[PDB]
Swiss-Prot record:
Disulfide-bond pairs as recorded: none
Full protein segment contained here: 275 to 492 of 607
Domain of life according to the entry: Eukaryota
Claim: Oxidoreductase is one of the keywords in the record: no
Organism, as annotated: Neocallimastix patriciarum (Rumen fungus)
Name of this chain's protein: Bifunctional endo-1,4-beta-xylanase A
Entry similarity comment: Belongs to the glycosyl hydrolase 11 (cellulase G) family.
Known role: Hydrolyzes xylans into xylobiose and xylose.
GO terms of molecular function: endo-1,4-beta-xylanase activity
Amino acid sequence: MKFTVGNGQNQHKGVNDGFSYEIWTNGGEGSMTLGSGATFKAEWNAAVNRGNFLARRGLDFGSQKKATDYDYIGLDYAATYKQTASASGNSRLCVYGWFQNRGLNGVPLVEYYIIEDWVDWVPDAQGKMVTIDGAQYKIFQMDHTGPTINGGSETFKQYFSVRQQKRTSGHITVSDHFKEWAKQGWGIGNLYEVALNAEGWQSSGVADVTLLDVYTT
């Protein structure tokens, strides 16, 4: 089952087997092919000025409770991921989601990234190295202004963990990243979703996610 963007429709989002799916582009083309469960394969050609593409699948949490209230959140994945063109472009493979702050006081709206692999460029800022799942990640936060899960342009926060040693398979203790961000004093809203995300800016490539499991205990 395939969903194509950049040829009439710029987005498709839905659910299958209890896991979300979403593909979107501005100015590129691409497709996502679902597999069982949360698995999928995606391909994009957006190696054009301001070409932008995303494909992601994940577990919705309903924005019900503080992300760090969940005792354990695991994500296990295996993928092949390749960038094949770059017009001064880049891409990343990452865990992705939001902390919703609707109804919450003195808490920011957060889009978060746990970046496992990237090509040519990755976000960076003054940050701190931490050890999670036996591996080094740099954590930092930054302002961003743009469209949001809530509607049009606003100024919100992005939280990042960037894996120092790139990889395309393994176990992520997603709840340990949330704890590390919490330890910095950063505000933590209600968990919207936990997804695995392939995105590309002014690039082309493929991500074939053959294993993807997201769970909470």
